[PDB]
Amino acid sequence: GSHMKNSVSVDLPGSMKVLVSKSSNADGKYDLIATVDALELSGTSDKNNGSGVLEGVKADASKVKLTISDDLGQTTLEVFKSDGSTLVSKKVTSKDKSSTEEKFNEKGEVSEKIITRADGTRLEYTGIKSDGSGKAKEVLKGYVLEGTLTAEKTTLVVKEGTVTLSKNISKSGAVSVELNDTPPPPPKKTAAWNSGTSTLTITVNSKKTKDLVFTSSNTITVQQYDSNGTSLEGSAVEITKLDEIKNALK
Amino acid sequence: GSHMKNSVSVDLPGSMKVLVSKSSNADGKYDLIATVDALELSGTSDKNNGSGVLEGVKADASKVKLTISDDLGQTTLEVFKSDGSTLVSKKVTSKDKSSTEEKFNEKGEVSEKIITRADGTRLEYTGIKSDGSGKAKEVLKGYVLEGTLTAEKTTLVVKEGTVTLSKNISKSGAVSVELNDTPPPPPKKTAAWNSGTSTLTITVNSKKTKDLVFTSSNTITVQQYDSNGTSLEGSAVEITKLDEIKNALK
């Protein structure tokens, strides 16, 4: 960690601490150093409470800037490219424990974003595009909702069968929810008639279910197919009551 | 019943008997008498086996004619109006026990018909119209099929739910069978969103089923309605797993 001669440690939003000198230097400013992700950042501020701006250079020459607001209520951590201006990442963190993490692209535009709310739930956007669209994920206490982002709204989706539930979050943070059900057509009973055999073959779900035979003795028999609709099983049973015909039509 | 001097009883198709004289009269003919529905019918035939034509008058002046075929294999019983020509009923009966009963109309046209087959099953047509249409009924061993008649065919119908089975009988007596199923659209889950209450109310079959509440603490609760969809029951249960959301969408 960080060490300073005649200093005081000050706790900061989002894990961080800064050391600030007990006294002022030759110019009246106070010395600040902090250690973030094993990199030492340093600066001078007119204030002596821990606020100000600290800077450091990574071993790959990336520039790191930590800005601490006057009231110590917010830290901004920025990582830049070598040039010191093309952003790579930006993390704004608050005392209430809320935060925004952005990652940037070659064009100087945001391509990922993690929003952490005070209560510990998060919204994660990945793969953000020029048109504002992207993948989306809400992390909640005990589970995760998946969906996508457009320029206008985030749409989280849960599926059960033909039922779709959509949670929409607007740019203001307003929730609205919708539901859709596209149920399949129900199982319909069709039939084909063989006049050579005087037989009606009934079908459901592309499986043959039963044969009704209309006999030369003016009787009806019923016989079931195997539950694969492949071929007949048992023997033909003769119909003696109207109710038995209705039953075979169920 | 009927009595004749020096006669012989001869059994006839469809219950009937005729007495025929042992000897011939002055003209060489044989005397026939029979009793049908308590009416005595009489005639003379050249034959002596029981064949010929017998006639009688009812108390209301209706003319009755019984014709017995040469081979004793068929009886025709006709009832006429007073005039002796406008038919009322006609019953042709065979030795195999098969028969046709027709009833006629004011116009001299058939308005009911019972067909009895050798095996004892029947087709009954009632209310027959000028265009050939009518009500229809097949009497089978152990049950009865209902339907209607057109000029081209008889159509007997059995119904079970949305399933219709049709037995068609052509004029030749050829059977053909069809089936129809008009299933209702399946139960679809709709929903309405109340932004004031952050609540999604799900409905099935015009009954409200459950409320999903999307809370200010970034949680979801579910609560069921009474099985009449009238109002809420139990208390709201909080969702802690994705599977529980899927479950409430079943």
From Swiss-Prot, chains A, B:
<dbReference type="InterPro" id="IPR001809">
    <property type="entry name" value="OM_lipoprot_Borrelia"/>
</dbReference>
<keyword id="KW-0732">Signal</keyword>
<keyword id="KW-0998">Cell outer membrane</keyword>
<keyword id="KW-0472">Membrane</keyword>
<comment type="similarity">
    <text>Belongs to the OspA lipoprotein family.</text>
</comment>
<keyword id="KW-0449">Lipoprotein</keyword>
<dbReference type="GO" id="GO:0016020">
    <property type="term" value="C:membrane"/>
</dbReference>
<dbReference type="InterPro" id="IPR023322">
    <property type="entry name" value="OM_lipoprot_dom_sf"/>
</dbReference>
<dbReference type="GO" id="GO:0009986">
    <property type="term" value="C:cell surface"/>
</dbReference>
<dbReference type="Pfam" id="PF00820">
    <property type="entry name" value="Lipoprotein_1"/>
</dbReference>
<keyword id="KW-0614">Plasmid</keyword>
<keyword id="KW-0564">Palmitate</keyword>
<protein>
    <recommendedName>
        <fullName>Outer surface protein A</fullName>
    </recommendedName>
</protein>
<dbReference type="GO" id="GO:0009279">
    <property type="term" value="C:cell outer membrane"/>
</dbReference>
<comment type="function">
    <text>Induces host (human and mouse) cytokine release by monocyte cell lines via TLR2 and CD14; nonlipidated protein does not stimulate host cells.</text>
</comment>
